[PDB]
Design an enzyme around this catalytic site. Sequence first.
Site, PDB file in Angstrom:
ATOM      1  N   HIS A 116      27.159  34.475  85.847  1.00 24.97           N
ATOM      2  CA  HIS A 116      25.760  34.239  86.295  1.00 24.97           C
ATOM      3  C   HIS A 116      25.667  34.074  87.815  1.00 24.97           C
ATOM      4  O   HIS A 116      24.570  33.904  88.313  1.00 24.97           O
ATOM      5  CB  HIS A 116      25.154  33.002  85.559  1.00 24.97           C
ATOM      6  CG  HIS A 116      25.392  31.561  86.035  1.00 24.97           C
ATOM      7  ND1 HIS A 116      26.148  30.660  85.468  1.00 24.97           N
ATOM      8  CD2 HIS A 116      24.818  30.943  87.116  1.00 24.97           C
ATOM      9  CE1 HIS A 116      26.047  29.554  86.148  1.00 24.97           C
ATOM     10  NE2 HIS A 116      25.240  29.704  87.156  1.00 24.97           N
ATOM     11  N   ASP A 144      30.666  33.481  80.219  1.00 27.77           N
ATOM     12  CA  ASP A 144      30.180  33.343  81.617  1.00 27.77           C
ATOM     13  C   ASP A 144      31.396  33.322  82.597  1.00 27.77           C
ATOM     14  O   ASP A 144      31.744  32.306  83.173  1.00 27.77           O
ATOM     15  CB  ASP A 144      29.380  32.060  81.719  1.00 27.77           C
ATOM     16  CG  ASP A 144      28.608  31.987  83.062  1.00 27.77           C
ATOM     17  OD1 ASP A 144      28.521  32.976  83.785  1.00 27.77           O
ATOM     18  OD2 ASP A 144      28.078  30.938  83.398  1.00 27.77           O
ATOM     19  N   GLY A 163      24.749  25.049  92.174  1.00 27.04           N
ATOM     20  CA  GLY A 163      25.498  25.193  93.474  1.00 27.04           C
ATOM     21  C   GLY A 163      26.998  25.028  93.193  1.00 27.04           C
ATOM     22  O   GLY A 163      27.840  25.499  93.942  1.00 27.04           O
TER      23      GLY A 163
HETATM   24  C1  LIG Z   1      18.366  26.941  88.550  1.00 23.17           C
HETATM   25  C2  LIG Z   1      19.863  27.091  88.434  1.00 23.17           C
HETATM   26  C3  LIG Z   1      20.399  28.237  88.939  1.00 23.17           C
HETATM   27  C4  LIG Z   1      21.739  28.403  88.864  1.00 23.17           C
HETATM   28 BR1  LIG Z   1      22.374  30.031  89.638  1.00 23.17          BR
HETATM   29  C5  LIG Z   1      22.610  27.457  88.288  1.00 23.17           C
HETATM   30  O1  LIG Z   1      23.972  27.712  88.239  1.00 23.17           O
HETATM   31  C6  LIG Z   1      22.077  26.276  87.766  1.00 23.17           C
HETATM   32  C7  LIG Z   1      22.901  25.283  87.183  1.00 23.17           C
HETATM   33  C8  LIG Z   1      22.513  24.111  86.534  1.00 23.17           C
HETATM   34  C9  LIG Z   1      23.672  23.455  86.204  1.00 23.17           C
HETATM   35  C10 LIG Z   1      23.887  22.229  85.560  1.00 23.17           C
HETATM   36  C11 LIG Z   1      25.239  21.798  85.373  1.00 23.17           C
HETATM   37  C12 LIG Z   1      25.579  20.554  84.737  1.00 23.17           C
HETATM   38  N1  LIG Z   1      26.857  20.253  84.621  1.00 23.17           N
HETATM   39  N2  LIG Z   1      24.645  19.731  84.282  1.00 23.17           N
HETATM   40  C13 LIG Z   1      26.271  22.641  85.844  1.00 23.17           C
HETATM   41  C14 LIG Z   1      25.997  23.850  86.475  1.00 23.17           C
HETATM   42  C15 LIG Z   1      24.690  24.226  86.647  1.00 23.17           C
HETATM   43  N3  LIG Z   1      24.203  25.298  87.215  1.00 23.17           N
HETATM   44  C16 LIG Z   1      20.685  26.099  87.843  1.00 23.17           C
END
Ligand SMILES: Cc1cc(Br)c([O-])c(-c2cc3cc(C(N)=[NH2+])ccc3[nH]2)c1
Length: 223
Positions: free
Chosen positions: A40, A84, A175
């Site tokens: 992604h 992913d 991020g």
């Molecule tokens: C809006 C958006 C866009 C991208 Br590109 C992301 O990778 C994410 C993302 C949310 C998110 C949440 C988590 C967690 N451990 N709670 C980990 C990676 C994530 N990546 C969100």
Amino acid sequence: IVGGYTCGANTVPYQVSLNSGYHFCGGSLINSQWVVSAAHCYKSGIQVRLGEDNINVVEGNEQFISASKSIVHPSYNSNTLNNDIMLIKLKSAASLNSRVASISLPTSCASAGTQCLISGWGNTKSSGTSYPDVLKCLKAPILSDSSCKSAYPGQITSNMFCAGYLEGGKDSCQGDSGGPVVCSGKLQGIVSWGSGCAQKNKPGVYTKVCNYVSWIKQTIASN
Ligand SMILES: Cc1cc(Br)c([O-])c(-c2cc3cc(C(N)=[NH2+])ccc3[nH]2)c1
Ligand SMILES: [Ca+2]
């Protein structure tokens, strides 16, 4: 990384920053010409930044190399985020040393309870965005499959595992995606998703790398 700590410059030598004019995802160096990240995080125009610590200042040890190709897993599903994982070949090999080094792929999967290190320059707030300048770290345990599935019913496949704290407060975040989950010195996970960040009962979900080691080896071998 929410609730994490400053890692210290170059203490995570396999961590890379994927940059397209700004930092957008992390990745892990597995050999001098290949990096593993999340499917992604794919896009064109990726420059890989190695030896980084403060992403907004050149301080020394950095190596900026453009990506020659990105190989998203053929069965990646953007709606479920199953598979992913993505491989990026670098235009030229990186110079490895103690500040830039590769991490080893696992020989076996890890068990729940195993403690791992997650790092990245992703958001540090669970409510709002605050992106750091230096690399953040978090030590988190892999959770059992029942707790993972009770947390995300119907959304966990066998290529994912949960790691984190059900009480909330410590987690990876936006991020951090594409970055490393290292346990016992082996790359066991790739930051993939979660519901919000550091929320109670909603742990992080990671790509289970032990299920892709034959694929990574065959793909690097044929490219
Ligand atoms: C809006 C958006 C866009 C991208 Br590109 C992301 O990778 C994410 C993302 C949310 C998110 C949440 C988590 C967690 N451990 N709670 C980990 C990676 C994530 N990546 C969100
Ligand atoms: Ca820098």
